[PDB]
Design a protein around this ligand. Sequence first.
Ligand SMILES: *C(=O)c1ccccc1OP(=O)(O)O
Length: 105
Amino acid sequence: SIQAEEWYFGKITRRESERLLLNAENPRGTFLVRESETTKGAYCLSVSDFDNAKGLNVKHYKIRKLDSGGFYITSRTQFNSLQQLVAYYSKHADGLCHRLTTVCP
Ligand SMILES: *C(=O)c1ccccc1OP(=O)(O)O
């Protein structure tokens, strides 16, 4: 049940997700999952990042869900549940700005 996950923030806006993530205390990979503002049936993974070029900044990735029942950011790497997707990206950075580390405070 996606709604029971502490990293699932539900229906909050993109601007709100940035307000929460742009905190100097958040290390790289601090994240949250929310509903997309514009895409019905898609979720959004918002992630904090930090580099000397840009300093602290936030990236947003669209998580698609198939009717067939699979979750993915890239169609080449699919998961049976959102929870499995989060667990996988907490170990592999792949194409993300950083691996997922901590749930947004
Ligand atoms: C995720 O839903 C998403 C992905 C990438 C950039 C922005 C974004 O958000 P909104 O879909 O809520 O605009």
